[PDB]
Short mmCIF file of C-alpha atoms in Angstrom, two decimals:
data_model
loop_
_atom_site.label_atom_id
_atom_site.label_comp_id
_atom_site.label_asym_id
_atom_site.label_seq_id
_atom_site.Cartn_x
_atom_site.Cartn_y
_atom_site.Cartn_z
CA UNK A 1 98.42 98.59 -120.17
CA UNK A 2 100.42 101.01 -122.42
CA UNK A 3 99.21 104.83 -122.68
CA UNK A 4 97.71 104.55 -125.69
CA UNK A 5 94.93 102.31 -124.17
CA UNK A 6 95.16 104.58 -121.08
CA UNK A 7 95.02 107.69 -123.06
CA UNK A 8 91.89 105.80 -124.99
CA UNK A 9 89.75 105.17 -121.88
CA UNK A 10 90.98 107.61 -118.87
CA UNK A 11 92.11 110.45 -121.36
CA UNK A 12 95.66 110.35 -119.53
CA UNK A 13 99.03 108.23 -120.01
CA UNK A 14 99.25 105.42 -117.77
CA UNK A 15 101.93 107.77 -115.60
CA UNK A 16 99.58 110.30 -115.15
CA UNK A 17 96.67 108.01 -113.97
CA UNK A 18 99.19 106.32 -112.17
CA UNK A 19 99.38 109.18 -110.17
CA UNK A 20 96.00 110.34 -109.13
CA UNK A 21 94.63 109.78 -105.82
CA UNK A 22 93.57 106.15 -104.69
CA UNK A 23 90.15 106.45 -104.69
CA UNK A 24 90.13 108.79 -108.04
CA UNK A 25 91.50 105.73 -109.66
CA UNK A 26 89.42 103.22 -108.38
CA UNK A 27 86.27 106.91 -109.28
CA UNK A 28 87.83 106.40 -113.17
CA UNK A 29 87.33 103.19 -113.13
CA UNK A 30 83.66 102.63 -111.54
CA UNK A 31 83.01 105.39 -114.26
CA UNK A 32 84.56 103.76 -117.50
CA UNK A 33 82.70 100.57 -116.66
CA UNK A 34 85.60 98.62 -116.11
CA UNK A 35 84.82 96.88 -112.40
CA UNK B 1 98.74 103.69 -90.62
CA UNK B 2 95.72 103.42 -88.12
CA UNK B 3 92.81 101.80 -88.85
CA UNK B 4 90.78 104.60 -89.97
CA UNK B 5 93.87 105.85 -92.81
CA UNK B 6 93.99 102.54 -93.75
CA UNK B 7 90.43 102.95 -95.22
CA UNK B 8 91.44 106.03 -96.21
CA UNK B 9 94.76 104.58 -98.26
CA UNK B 10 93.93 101.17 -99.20
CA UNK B 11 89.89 101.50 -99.81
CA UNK B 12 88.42 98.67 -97.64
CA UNK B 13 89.17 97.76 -94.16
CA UNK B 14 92.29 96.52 -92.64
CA UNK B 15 90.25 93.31 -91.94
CA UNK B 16 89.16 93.24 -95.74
CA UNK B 17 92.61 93.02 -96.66
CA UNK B 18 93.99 90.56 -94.02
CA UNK B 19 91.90 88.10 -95.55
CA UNK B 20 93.05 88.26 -98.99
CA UNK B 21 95.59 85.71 -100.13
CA UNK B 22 98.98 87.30 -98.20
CA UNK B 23 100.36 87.37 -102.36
CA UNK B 24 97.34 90.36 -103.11
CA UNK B 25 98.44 91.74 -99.99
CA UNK B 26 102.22 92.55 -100.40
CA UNK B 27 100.59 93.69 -104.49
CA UNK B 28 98.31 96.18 -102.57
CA UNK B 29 100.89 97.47 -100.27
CA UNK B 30 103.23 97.48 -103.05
CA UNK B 31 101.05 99.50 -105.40
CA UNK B 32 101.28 102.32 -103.08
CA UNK B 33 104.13 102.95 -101.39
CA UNK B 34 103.55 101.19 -97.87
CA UNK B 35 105.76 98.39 -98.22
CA UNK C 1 106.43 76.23 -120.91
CA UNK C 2 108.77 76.05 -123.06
CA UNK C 3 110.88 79.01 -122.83
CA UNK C 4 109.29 80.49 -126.04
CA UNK C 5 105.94 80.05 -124.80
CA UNK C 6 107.11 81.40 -121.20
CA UNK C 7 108.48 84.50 -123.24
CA UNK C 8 105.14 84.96 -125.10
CA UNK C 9 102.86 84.37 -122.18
CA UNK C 10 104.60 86.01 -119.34
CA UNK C 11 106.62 88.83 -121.74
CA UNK C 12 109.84 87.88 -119.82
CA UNK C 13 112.36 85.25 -119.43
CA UNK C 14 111.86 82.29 -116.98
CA UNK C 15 115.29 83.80 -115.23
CA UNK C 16 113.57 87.51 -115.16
CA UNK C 17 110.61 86.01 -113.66
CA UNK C 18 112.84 84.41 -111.50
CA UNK C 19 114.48 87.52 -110.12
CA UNK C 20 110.29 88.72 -109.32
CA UNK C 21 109.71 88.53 -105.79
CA UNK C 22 107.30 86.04 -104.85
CA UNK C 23 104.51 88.01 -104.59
CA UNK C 24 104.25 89.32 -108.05
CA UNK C 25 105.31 85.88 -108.98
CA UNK C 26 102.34 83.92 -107.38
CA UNK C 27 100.08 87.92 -109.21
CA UNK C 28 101.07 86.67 -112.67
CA UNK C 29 100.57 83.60 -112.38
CA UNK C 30 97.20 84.28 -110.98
CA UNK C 31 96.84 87.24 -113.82
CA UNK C 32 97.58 84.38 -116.69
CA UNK C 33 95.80 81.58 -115.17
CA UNK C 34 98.81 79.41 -114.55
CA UNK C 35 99.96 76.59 -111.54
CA UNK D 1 114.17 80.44 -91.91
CA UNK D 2 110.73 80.26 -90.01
CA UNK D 3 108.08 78.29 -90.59
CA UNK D 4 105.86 80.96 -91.73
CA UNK D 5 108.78 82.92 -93.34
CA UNK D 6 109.60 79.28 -94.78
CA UNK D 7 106.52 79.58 -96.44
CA UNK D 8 106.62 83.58 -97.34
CA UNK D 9 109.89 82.64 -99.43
CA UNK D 10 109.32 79.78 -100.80
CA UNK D 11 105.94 79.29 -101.48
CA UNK D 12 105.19 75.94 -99.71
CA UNK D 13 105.22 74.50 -96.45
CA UNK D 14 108.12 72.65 -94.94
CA UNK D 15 107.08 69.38 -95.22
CA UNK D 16 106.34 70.25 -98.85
CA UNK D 17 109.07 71.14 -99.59
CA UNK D 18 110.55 68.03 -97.91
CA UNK D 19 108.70 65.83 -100.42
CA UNK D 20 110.61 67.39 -103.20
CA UNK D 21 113.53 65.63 -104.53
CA UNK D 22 116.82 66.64 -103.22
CA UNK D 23 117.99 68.18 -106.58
CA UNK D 24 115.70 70.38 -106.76
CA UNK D 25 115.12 71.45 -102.74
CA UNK D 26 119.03 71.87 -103.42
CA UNK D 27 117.76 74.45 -107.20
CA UNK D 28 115.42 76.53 -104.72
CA UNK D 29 117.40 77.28 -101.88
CA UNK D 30 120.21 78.49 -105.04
CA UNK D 31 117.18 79.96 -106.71
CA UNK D 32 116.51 82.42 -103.68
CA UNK D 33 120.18 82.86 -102.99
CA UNK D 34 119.24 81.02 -99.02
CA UNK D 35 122.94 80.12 -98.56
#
């Protein structure tokens, strides 16, 4: 992944997204187009 | 966890997940902190 | 592979890969494609 | 090892495994330390 691409799509390192809630992740995600 | 956490955790039902291949499964379980 | 291409497509050694349990070795194989 | 744990650890099913050659049922069982 690396946080740079995290940083460039969620706005957050990979550690941080890393630690949101479940379902915020899979929120992010549904949002950014990405499943 | 019961069945209803599990939804609550994991995002789909515990049978959902018992039919994904058992290598997704210890992944999933893995990604959290419930195995 | 040869253990160059192993390195390049997997990012690790065969004997790191090794060490993976089996789980996350049958997840990258899956993630890269591979038997 | 079980049948099913057989299978958890080593990928395959006994009588898989079986139709290996013995060098290399002799490389697994080394491979996952099952001695």
């Amino acid at each position: 992944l690396s946080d740079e691409d995290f940083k460039a799509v969620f706005g957050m390192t990979r550690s941080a997204f890393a630690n949101l809630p479940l379902w915020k992740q899979x929120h992010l995600k549904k949002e950014k187009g990405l499943f």
